Design a protein around this ligand. Sequence first.
Ligand SMILES: CC#Cc1cncc(-c2cccc([C@@]3(c4cc(C)c(=O)n(CC)c4)N=C(N)c4c(F)cccc43)c2)c1
Length: 375
Amino acid sequence: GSFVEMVDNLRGKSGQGYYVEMTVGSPPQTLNILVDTGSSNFAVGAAPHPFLHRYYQRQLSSTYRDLRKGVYVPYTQGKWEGELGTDLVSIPHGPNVTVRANIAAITESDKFFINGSNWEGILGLAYAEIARPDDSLEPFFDSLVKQTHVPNLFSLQLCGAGGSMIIGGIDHSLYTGSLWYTPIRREWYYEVIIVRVEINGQDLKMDCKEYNYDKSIVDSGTTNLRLPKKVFEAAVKSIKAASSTEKFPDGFWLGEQLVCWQAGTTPWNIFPVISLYLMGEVTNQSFRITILPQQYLRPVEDVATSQDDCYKFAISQSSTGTVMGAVIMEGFYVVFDRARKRIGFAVSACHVHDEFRTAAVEGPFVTLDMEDCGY
Ligand SMILES: CC#Cc1cncc(-c2cccc([C@@]3(c4cc(C)c(=O)n(CC)c4)N=C(N)c4c(F)cccc43)c2)c1
């Protein structure tokens, strides 16, 4: 179960999710599971559904234990409902271990499962504070650390059109340059602090608390870079100005319409780079991660539109704070250092670049005239 054996253990894409193979029950039942740093339940399809190729069959598992407790989870975009239980879980291309973990067996759901996503469940990697029905339900990663010798750290190398999830350590072959750390503000979501935002080197000039209204998180279970209204509007106005040689419909900027160019002609150069400055481990020091248009213009693979390269604008408005989703994580090696309450970023081996620009992790930056950016 070495790190080299864990490399390339993920499949999928930013739009439908990145997933890892796992087994549940005895004899083991293989399932594809979405790697989700934005939730804390290990929730798996346990009943037939039109979008599921397979599902967890508890009756076939001699090791299943029923907790006699239901779980009901409505959220803005949909819902899932299920039964809580425990069973044996393993990650075949992960650590060489088997643990007993809580499993929420999904019996009913609405707009939860995605057609052609190729996953049957979700591995919620965030903390117990946000687990459903409450924080008494121990998340999977917590059970793994308690029951094995596994160091309290995992890292994600998401690669654009799979990637790697290394549990227990840092795989140096997955990144170049320096690894810059941002503190985990609170252990609920992987909450962080953005101190500055620039669009093509031009500062958005907002009070830094605006960037974190009401929180900022690192979420591998969200596709887009999601920004609070005020920040979102300034970003769009700034991107529109930088790209003014071409005019796109309002629907493109709203993320409801594709923009298409003849195959291979995408004018990358007309789109600016976005720099997100994250709080450093030292007072008023920060580092920046730079996002190229290859990251924020998400390609939409469709045989029917294939004479063209078509894209969705992968930056959208949020009313629940900033979400640094998969389009942000792609091309970075992201270390979820739970042991040291910090998140590391470095340029990935699968990073984005063209012949003019490259995604980067750079620092340090100093800001003497700073307030706390935390909301
Ligand atoms: C990259 C990527 C991705 C991706 C693409 N399509 C669907 C999903 C998805 C499907 C179902 C549920 C969730 C989702 C999620 C997962 C679980 C287990 C859960 O209990 N909830 C509700 C609290 C939400 N995980 C999130 N991080 C998230 C989010 F920020 C906003 C809405 C929904 C979610 C996410 C993820």
